Amino acid sequence: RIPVVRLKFGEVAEATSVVVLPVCKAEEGEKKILEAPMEIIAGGDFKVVEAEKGWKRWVVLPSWNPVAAIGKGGVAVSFRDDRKVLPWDGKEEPLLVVADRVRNVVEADDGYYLVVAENGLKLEKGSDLKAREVKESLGMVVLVVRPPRE
Amino acid sequence: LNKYGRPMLGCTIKPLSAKNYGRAVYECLRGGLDFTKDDENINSQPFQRWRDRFLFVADAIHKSQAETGEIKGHYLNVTAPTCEEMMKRAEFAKELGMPIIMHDFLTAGFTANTTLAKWCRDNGVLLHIHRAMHAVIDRQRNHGIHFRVLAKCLRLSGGDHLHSGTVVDKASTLGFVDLMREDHIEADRSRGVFFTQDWASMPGVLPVASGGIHVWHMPALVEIFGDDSVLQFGHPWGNAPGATANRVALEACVQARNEGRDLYREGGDILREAGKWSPELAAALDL
């Protein structure tokens, strides 16, 4: 289904590589995701970066391979509760969803695509969108990040 | 024993002093056979006490195996009055380094037999059983113990061989052959196995044919007992020539089976009769 890698406590000891994504929220809505800077210019030495647009919120994510692969068009969406967004089971915790707007076109039947739901923002299977003939989406979910816990 | 594909071949001795015994068994070994067999009732009678016979047969096996390269052996007999003396003879057989040993499970009882098998496991010497009483409790159709039960329990206790006997009913014999050598048998009234006797990866036991046969019946046996078997049996030339004749005949039959020559149909013609030391075979084969 959706690839889910959970951030864990104590992971701050030695990250060799890390990536940065702008942050959008369920309350902020689809408009914020359109507003977020897509191209982050890497003029980096050990990371120095500039963004095409100024953005208030930034999440620092480890260079997990799916997140690293995205590059441009990478965004993180904050959800207060996991259950509403996740088609499957949830444990009642805040959810971070990484989405690639570059692949927003629905071509992957099993692929999950962030879309604007009537209630708010939801992750929808591609096949389901194809059944409703929705050719485009906000972003294609690449990874779901779960919070550190005890 | 470094012997693959082919079955193993066993000589018997026609009859003696112990020196005569050694020379004779060395002849019937070097001629190109695998095993030799002591007679059915030669253990300790006042001709060949165990110690002299054992020593001499061991020397003969050594000499022959050396001067022929391949590996050979003799079914030394240890069916002893008491138990601890059986163990004495077994130890002595080990000291010389013989790899096989006989026993008579009925006439010596399953108890001592199991002890011998367990001792073998530790000392690594192939135990070779020999019925020597079965006919008292099987042959009567309507009474007794059918032999296949004895075979089953014997493979359950000990033994790396078993004198199944000649074949020319045969259906029952082939059946219980499958019953001991395999490791899973489906019930088959016709073949004569009643219950789907499992075996839980316990090793098999080579069935052995014995007596009442000769080289002229070589193919059928190889055909019936397949490959994993111990085929066993004077000659108009002497022991060594007839021995080598048996060897080369069995070899030709194996070659032909692999070659896919129908043995049961061609058994009378497959014989060498020219070429591969048919002189040593002598093509004696008089009826």
Partner: protein, 154 residues
């Protein structure tokens, strides 16, 4: 010593001594050079002498011998050399232990096991049934069975 008085037989233009040179690196097709070893010990050699010189356990030597035998028996029998090719690409387990006496049984079992591709005791798996002909000397049920195809004779 060095008698080998027992059975002794009494690429067609090789030498005598260095024949084993064709076998250390095995620069030939798998199952054609087994009769080469046959002719090698035709002069009176034995696999115990060949193990420590070539690097082929006696089991593998007899395997190669019977495999060359089967490839020969099938080369002069049927078209579709792929069958024989299905052997030349290794995998001799499909052909070992020819109990099936005649040649028709040979080609039948060969093509069937090629069709179904059951190694790891599959050869005997089929043989134990094919050699158990569907008459068993006049049993009940020989009227609606085949006898040459293992699919309808198993």
């Amino acid at each position: 010593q060095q008698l080998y008085q027992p059975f002794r037989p009494p690429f067609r233009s090789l030498d005598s001594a260095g024949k084993i040179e064709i076998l250390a690196g095995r620069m030939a097709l798998w199952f054609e050079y087994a009769p080469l070893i046959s002719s090698l010990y035709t002069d009176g050699f034995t696999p115990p002498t060949i193990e420590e010189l070539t690097g082929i356990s006696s089991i593998e030597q007899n395997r190669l011998i019977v495999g060359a035998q089967v490839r020969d028996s099938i080369l002069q029998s049927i078209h579709e050399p792929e069958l024989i090719s299905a052997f030349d690409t290794g995998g001799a387990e499909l052909l070992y232990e020819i109990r099936l006496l005649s040649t028709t049984q040979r080609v039948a079992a060969a093509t069937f096991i090629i069709d179904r591709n059951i190694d790891s005791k599959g050869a005997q798996d089929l043989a134990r049934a094919i050699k158990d002909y569907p008459n068993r000397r006049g049993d009940v049920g020989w009227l609606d069975f085949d006898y040459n195809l293992p699919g309808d004779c198993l």
